[PDB]
């Protein structure tokens, strides 16, 4: 209500179903209309359907009729979307969106989104390599330090630095799909070279699908 909090990233095989939750954290779904909206890679917002619990009504976009069920559970104060017979094309970010039950109302509250990947490819955890600058590179007063997160499936990986402490001048690049069918990304921080003397620089990599949690300290070579 104050905050729509969705379930974490999901990976499914084609033909399977996915159930995504949306918890009205510190509020309710009473006398609201609850929609699901998706955003496929590099595409726009696509409205899937809506329920208005108070009226016992539900409706879907024609192209999702027979594929999607939206259910609200008062007990858990949770809205669910179940998408069945998944295909590659259903790989997207799914958002819950709340609006007042009244005709014409706008979506004033959105969930953070849930990434769904639909693929028959096997889950595989990443190999994490340091991106270590030469001493010559750092001699100019700036140290570019990074971690290469290689050969994983599926998205996402999360990368932090110093377990949350370093955010300014962190660039975590969008993942690239390689010709192998595996993703890679890099995350780099650029810091004054002298800071290598006064603190550690540790990249924290989490790949939840493979239960991978890796920390790597990065130093110049």
């Amino acid at each position: 209500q104050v905050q729509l909090v969705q379930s974490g990233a999901e990976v499914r095989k084609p033909g399977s179903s996915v159930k995504i939750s949306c918890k009205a954290s510190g509020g309710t779904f009473n006398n609201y209309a609850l929609s699901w909206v998706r955003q496929a890679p590099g595409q726009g917002l696509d409205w899937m359907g809506e329920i208005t619990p108070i009226f016992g009504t539900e409706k879907y976009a024609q192209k999702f009729q027979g594929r999607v069920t939206i259910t609200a559970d008062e007990s858990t104060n949770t809205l669910y979307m179940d998408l069945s017979s998944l295909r590659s094309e259903d790989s997207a970010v799914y958002y819950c969106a709340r609006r007042g039950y009244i005709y014409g109302s706008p979506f004033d509250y959105w969930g953070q989104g849930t990434l769904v990947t639909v693929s028959s490819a096997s889950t595989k955890g990443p190999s994490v390599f340091p991106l270590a600058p030469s001493s010559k590179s750092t001699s100019g007063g700036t140290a570019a330090l990074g971690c290469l997160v290689k050969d994983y499936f599926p998205e996402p990986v999360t990368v932090s630095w110093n377990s949350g402490a370093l955010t300014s001048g962190v660039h975590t690049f969008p993942a690239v799909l390689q010709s192998s069918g595996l993703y890679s990304l890099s995350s780099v921080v650029t810091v004054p070279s002298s800071s290598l003397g006064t603190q550690t620089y540790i990249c924290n990599v989490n790949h939840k699908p493979s239960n991978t949690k890796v920390d790597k300290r990065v130093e110049p070579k």
Binding site: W47, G104, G113, P130, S134, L148, T190
Partner: protein, 211 residues
Amino acid sequence: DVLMTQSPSSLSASVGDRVTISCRASQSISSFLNWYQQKPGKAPKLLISAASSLSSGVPSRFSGSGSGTSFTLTISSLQPEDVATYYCQQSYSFLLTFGGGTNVEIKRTVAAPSVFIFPPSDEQLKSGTASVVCLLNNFYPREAKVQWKVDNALQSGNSQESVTEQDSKDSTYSLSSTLTLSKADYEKHKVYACEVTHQGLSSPVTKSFNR
């Protein structure tokens, strides 16, 4: 069904410029037209509802106008934090529909990239692949040419690039280019170089190491 069409598909302007985005409905939707802001991998945020009603907390530089089949969103004073995709959406008909989006970018003074090169880690080389990385930091504009040379042999079809979202504060980009080689191929060569061409640099900048 109501088809929502936005114009232009993208725009770039300077901080403080007044810019407008158009939204047309295939049939009259009365007042039932909403505008959202979305940054990449973030939840959309409601700006404007019922064509012209500003959401609480939204800066006054956002306004909306129109009725029937023609609507406009105006930003009177474009700020670096306004870089986003903006979507219109009709709440008139039984089945709701969005416009296709307008991508808003900031124009600022040219900034050349700071360039760094990373050899493959001894850790990676053990397992038979060599990733060489070139980093371009904090540059504007977006367009950049990154070429890989191995012993002066220009490389083809064995590199990939990734780019950051335009920075919400400084309006710059950063870019990574990754060259992928077998360990066998990497060990046969000495000079690894990334050559960067960009509007901020008088001559191409080359960063290199000897294996």
